[PDB]
Each structure stands twice: as structure tokens, then as C-alpha cells.
Amino acid sequence: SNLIEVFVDGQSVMVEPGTTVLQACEKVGMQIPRFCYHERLSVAGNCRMCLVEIEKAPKVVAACAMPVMKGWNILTNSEKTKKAREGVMEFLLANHPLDCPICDQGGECDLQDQSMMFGSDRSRFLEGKRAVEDKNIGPLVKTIMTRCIQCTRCIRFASEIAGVDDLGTTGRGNDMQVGTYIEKMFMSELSGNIIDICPVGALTSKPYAFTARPWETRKTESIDVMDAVG
């Protein structure tokens, strides 16, 4: 056995080598908040929400990418961890548009939920927000790039799962836009699943748009009959 010992909030647990801090905390039972991390996509680490503190160390580490070693104690509820989370989400919400009432993601938005959970209660931003030019990628996915937070799940999904390699980031700095750089339709077998893995309301479902709200819909678990995959 190659299992090594780590500590989450003082609680000992066994992990495999190469395990990230996020997976060890999940094995203990703590869900570290995340935006760009996905269990089925490659690790990107460009949102800095998962910054957790290792004790006896003068820096916060990215739990979605840091591999654990022996003797580590992970503090998921300390003071500087919460300070880092609040600062990161204040930066995230600094340029976010006030589009919540006219958003299809409202009520099932990850940004709203962790803003209520780990975020602050007021905004100190007294400047002007940015406005990204919209794009068209087909009659299935409605695109509003003013709401995108540049999490790069688009690029990783279109490069590692769909295998299209037609989505990317053009720009450098605060004006970097996630798009296609040309009038190209993102037509694929799995072109709708980006709507599933967009944490904000930047990519919505065009047939579903402006129809219902997530809190008033009953969910029934069923089986697809459209093909033989089941």
C-alpha cells in the first residue's frame, strides 16, 4: 500500500499519491468551492477560488492543482482562507453585469450561490464595468459574453471531449474574450453540454430561454429513448 496520511481540519485520512488537496477534502467530506475546476476536464487553475491554507506555511495554495504530501494539515475554515475567498469573489463580481432578473441562470447560478455562502455582503466597486461584444455560435447556444468570467471550461470541453478545437481566448488583460474570432458555428454532437458546464449565464439554451425558472420546475428521473445508448 502506498497510501499516505494527510489532515483536513485536524482529521486524519488516507490518500493515494498524486492526490490533489480538493480530492482529499472531498474524501473527508468538505467541498472546497471552485469555478474553473471540473472532475472530468483538465486542471486549469485560473480562477483562484479554491485557495486553501496549509498550516505552517506563509502562502495559500490552489487546492484544485496542489498535490498533497505527507504530514500536511489543511485548514478549510480558517481566517485567511475566507479572506482570500472574499477578495477573489469581490474581484470576480467587480465587472459582472447587473443582469440577474433577466438571466436564465438565476436560481441555479453557481456565482450567486457561493456569493451568498462565501462572498461578502456589499460592493466597494465605484468604477465603470466592461461590456463585451456578443457572439453567435448557432441557434442552440445563446451567447451573452458580458456575463462570462473567463473560466475556460469552453476551451477544455471543445478540445478534450468534443474534439472541435474551435473555441479560444482572443485578447490580453481585462479585454480578453472567449470566442471563436470569426463567424463560425459551434456545431457538434455534444454542443449543448457547454450550457451544462457554464457556471454563469453566459451560455444559455436558446429554446429554453425566457420560459421557466429553476425553483418552480419538478424534476423526474427518466431514460432517453432517442438512441440505443440509453
Partner 1 sequence: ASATRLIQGLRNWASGRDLQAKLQLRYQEISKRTQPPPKLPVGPSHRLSNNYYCA
Report the partner that residue 121 touches, choosing among ligand FES, K ion, partner 1, none (CB closer than 5 to 8 A by kind). Answer: partner 1
Binding mask of the shown chain, residues 64 to 93, with x at each position contacting ligand FES by CB under 6 A: x-----------------------------
Minimum distance from residue 6 beta carbon to K ion (Å): 34
> Of residues 54, 151, 158, 179, which one binds ligand SF4 by CB under 6 A?
151
Q: Residue 48 binds which entry of partner 1, ligand FES, K ion, none, with Cβ cut-offs from 5 to 8 Å by kind?
A: ligand FES
Residue 49 within binding range of ligand FES, rule CB under 6 A? yes
Shortest Å, Cβ 63 to ligand FES: 6
Applying the rule CB under 5 A, the residues between 198 and 227 that interact with K ion are: 198
- H/E/C letters for each residue in the chain? CCCEEEEECCEEEEECCCCEHHHHHHHHCCCCCCCCCCCCCCCCCCCCCCEEEECCCCCEEECCCCECCCCCEEECCCHHHHHHHHHHHHHHCCCCCCCHHHCCCCCCCHHHHHHHHCCCCCCCCCCCCCCCCCCCCCCCEEECCCCCCCCCHHHHHHHHCCCCCCCEEECCCCCCEEECCCCCCCCCCCCCHHHHCCCCCCEEECCCCCCCCHHHCCCCCCCCCCCCCC
- 45-74 residues near K ion, rule: CB under 5 A: none
Asked if residue 24 binds K ion (CB under 5 A), the reply is no
* Binding site residues, K ion, CB under 5 A: 198
* Binding site residues, ligand SF4, CB under 6 A: 96, 99-100, 103, 105-106, 109, 111-112, 147-154, 178, 197-203
